[PDB]
Amino acid sequence: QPEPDMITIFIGTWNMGNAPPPKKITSWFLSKGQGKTRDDSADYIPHDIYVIGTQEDPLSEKEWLEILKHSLQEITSVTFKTVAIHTLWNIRIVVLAKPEHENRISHICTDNVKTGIANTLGNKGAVGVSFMFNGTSLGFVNSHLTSGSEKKLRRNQNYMNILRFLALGDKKLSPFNITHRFTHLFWFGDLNYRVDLPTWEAETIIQKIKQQQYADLLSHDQLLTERREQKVFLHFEEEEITFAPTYRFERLTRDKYAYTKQKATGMKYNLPSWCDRVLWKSYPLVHVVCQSYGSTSDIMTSDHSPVFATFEAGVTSQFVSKNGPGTVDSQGQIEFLRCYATLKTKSQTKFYLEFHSSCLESFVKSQEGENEEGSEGELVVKFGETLPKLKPIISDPEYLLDQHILISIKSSDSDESYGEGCIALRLEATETQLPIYTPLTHHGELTGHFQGEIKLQTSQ
Numbered sequence: 001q002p003e004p005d006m007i008t009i010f011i012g013t014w015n016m017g018n019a020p021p022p023k024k025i026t027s028w029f030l031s032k033g034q035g036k037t038r039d040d041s042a043d044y045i046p047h048d049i050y051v052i053g054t055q056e057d058p059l060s061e062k063e064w065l066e067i068l069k070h071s072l073q074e075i076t077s078v079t080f081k082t083v084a085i086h087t088l089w090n091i092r093i094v095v096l097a098k099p100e101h102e103n104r105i106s107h108i109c110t111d112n113v114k115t116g117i118a119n120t121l122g123n124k125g126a127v128g129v130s131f132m133f134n135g136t137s138l139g140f141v142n143s144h145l146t147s148g149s150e151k152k153l154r155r156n157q158n159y160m161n162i163l164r165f166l167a168l169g170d171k172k173l174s175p176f177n178i179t180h181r182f183t184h185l186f187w188f189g190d191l192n193y194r195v196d197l198p199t200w201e202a203e204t205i206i207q208k209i210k211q212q213q214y215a216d217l218l219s220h221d222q223l224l225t226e227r228r229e230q231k232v233f234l235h236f237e238e239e240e241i242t243f244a245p246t247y248r249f250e251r252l253t254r255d256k257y258a259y260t261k262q263k264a265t266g267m268k269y270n271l272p273s274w275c276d277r278v279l280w281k282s283y284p285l286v287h288v289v290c291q292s293y294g295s296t297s298d299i300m301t302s303d304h305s306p307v308f309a310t311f312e313a314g315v316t317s318q319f320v321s322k323n324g325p326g327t328v329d330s331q332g333q334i335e336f337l338r339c340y341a342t343l344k345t346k347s348q349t350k351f352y353l354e355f356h357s358s359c360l361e362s363f364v365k366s367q368e369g370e371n372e373e374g375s376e377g378e379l380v381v382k383f384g385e386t387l388p389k390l391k392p393i394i395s396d397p398e399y400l401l402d403q404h405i406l407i408s409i410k411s412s413d414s415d416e417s418y419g420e421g422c423i424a425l426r427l428e429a430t431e432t433q434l435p436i437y438t439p440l441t442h443h444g445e446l447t448g449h450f451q452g453e454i455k456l457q458t459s460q
């Protein structure tokens, strides 16, 4: 039975509004309703992995697991295995996988982050799950960010705290946050970004939604505008939104948006908004294709509609050779020519590089680079031809060309990372000098970039 080179992943996000679900929720797992929906011809085909994020979830873990498993069994006639479940307050993540994947899944991690301080600590934050699927690392984050149209900057802060402090994936990757630890990272939830239009336009917005004319609403969506201005979710992707705003509905119908200020809303307006979202970030040149992104029409117990997204994702096998793992394969090497880092820092410490990859026995520290003054004020750290030669555990190009090198540039004075990035070994040629490039981030903010040339030697 051969190992897969692709899997499908279902991502769900639903703010349940503290109400139990209706008896049937299969439309969610089938990607049926509005938006980019799944073909009917696929309905009996199980996804490999289902990741369910809920917010304002009133159910016990046991109660929700029974509903989810019984739902999937009705659709697929498959009894899914529970990979992980983690709950912070009323924010929950469940990962389910086909039984054939049980002995492909390992290194399961869960964590949570509580956002805010005092007043604003006690119900918002994030839960997450990571694991290895054969040779591929997968991370999943369900966040419930700060509410309210006027609090976009609080949401951006919540985002930075979650990606700094959520402790998932390989702890040996110590310079790297969750935005660099995984081959594929999915981040979803009630992100709570709103359509930033005047209150007086509520009925006009509703009109536009009834016409299925979303363009003038999406151009004011705070998440799209904050992402375009590089304020949040830098280097994440989102599929085009082609479904109606998923908040705020009158319960037990979808015919009415309930936007007016009420004591129950703290006298705040809730103009129709795309609160409920799915984004992802995959390592460079790894296959990832969104095959659905939409909302259900028939699940009406909450003031939010459920959102679904599905993906084709590239995966690799757990490779063994005569040599690695447990030794190097002298027929493999990775060389770096004409390399330099450009950093936004006002500091003047010496800097060195760390190279981290599961194709290495352990991470590799470089010598210090040579600082020059850049012509526009920036710091340029020159490595030239001085970077060490990396010795992969396996030389077979079927393995090595699928790998990635994580780079941290660190202060010699403090050993703190000033920037993190990632280089793909999926090159156009071997034994050939080729340009490489990554942006550098720290705490998920842009801090610089790393560029130079690579020369990769494989067994072929």
Ligand SMILES: O=C(Cc1ccc(Cl)cc1)Nc1ncccn1
Residues within 6 Å of the ligand: 081, 082, 083, 084, 097, 101, 102, 103, 105, 106, 108
């Ligand atoms: O339970 C797991 C991890 C796992 C892996 C795959 C899946 Cl589909 C579900 C769970 N390991 C384990 N095994 C025996 C005793 C204790 N822990």
